[PDB]
Amino acid sequence: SPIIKLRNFNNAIKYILIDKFTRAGDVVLELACGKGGDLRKYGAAGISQFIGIDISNASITEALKRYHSMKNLEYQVILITGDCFGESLGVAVESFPECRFPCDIVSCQFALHYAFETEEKARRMLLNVVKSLKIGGYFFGTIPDSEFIRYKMNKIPESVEKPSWGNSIYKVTFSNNEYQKNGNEFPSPFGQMYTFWLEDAIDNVPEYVIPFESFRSLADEYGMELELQKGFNEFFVEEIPNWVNRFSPKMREGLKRSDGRYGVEGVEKEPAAYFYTTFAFRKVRDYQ
Ligand SMILES: C[n+]1cn([C@@H]2O[C@H](COP(=O)(O)OP(=O)(O)OP(=O)(O)O)[C@@H](O)[C@H]2O)c2nc(N)[nH]c(=O)c21
Ligand SMILES: Nc1ncnc2[nH]cnc12
């Protein structure tokens, strides 16, 4: 089905992205780790310690359930309930002294846009990231692509009170049309809400635009410089020649198109390959 193909494609993107930035022995902090479904990806890269934090105790309880049911992994796994975006990370990790900070990489998958609810939250998130990371370390992940959002919004007339687009498996519905009223520009980079539906995945949940230019300029303020901004389509097209034979048999077959090449085709292509982008930054200097 389209949704199964989308999940496999996005899982492949995460495999490639994690492998790109993680090295053997690294300590990884995963913000908004949800139910902790990427442990095997980090294990393949040879990490020494995974620290996952999520605001939901139901999610962490599930992540712990899932972790405890695995095997004799070669790495330590720490799973913590805490708010990675709205509060100092020190709050969440005070009672987990086994964490080894500063860490080598910070990851955040399909979640960092929640930090753009307000400027205060965006900045608190970035301060948490840089305080956690070694100089030279990387911050990477996957977000909705503001540039694709802007393209779709630029095709919506101002008469539409709640700008919306979608297909048989996903939909985006903006809370307001202030973008269109303001000359096709958001009135603020923060708090620009839209509800997101994805079949059997996200149940019409409010989230916020993450305008990439603002993310990048704020990250620079906190000492992080851009490493990667490729949309999922371009990232996959560039990385697939080196990855076809590295994927598991099941993931490779899942990516196989009707023409014998790899990727997504059919209705999942827009939400899987255009709606999201990769990001990465490197911490190049200390922040006072
Ligand atoms: C958390 N989240 C997940 N997605 C999309 O949903 C897909 C699945 O999201 P996922 O891999 O985080 O969870 P899943 O339900 O697959 O696994 P489980 O938690 O282990 O049961 C992703 O590949 C994205 O397409 C998301 N899409 C958007 N726009 N916003 C989100 O907050 C978001
Ligand atoms: N602030 C937050 N911290 C951690 N996980 C989250 N998921 C959604 N918002 C979150």
Numbering used by the authors: 138 to 425
Question: Please, what does the article write about this entry?
Answer:
Here we co-crystallized KlAbd1Δ137 with 0.9 mM m7GTP and determined the structure using KlAbd1Δ137-SAH as a search model. The final model was refined at 1.33 Å resolution with Rwork/Rfree of 18.5/20.3. Electron densities for m7GTP were observed in both methyl acceptor sites. Additional electron densities were observed in the methyl donor sites, which were interpreted as the co-purified adenine moiety of the product SAH. The tertiary structure of m7GTP-bound KlAbd1Δ137 was virtually identical to that of SAH-bound KlAbd1Δ137 (r.m.s.d. of 0.4 Å over 287 Cα positions). The guanine moiety of m7GTP is buried in a deep pocket created by Phe247, Ala248, His250, Phe333, Ile339, and Phe412. The guanine-N1 and -N2 atoms make a bidentate hydrogen bond with the Glu344-Oε1 and Oε2. Guanine-O6 makes direct and water-mediated hydrogen bonds with Tyr251-OH. Guanine-N3 makes a hydrogen bond to Tyr413-OH. The ribose O2′ makes hydrogen bonds with Asn147-Nδ2 and Tyr413-OH.
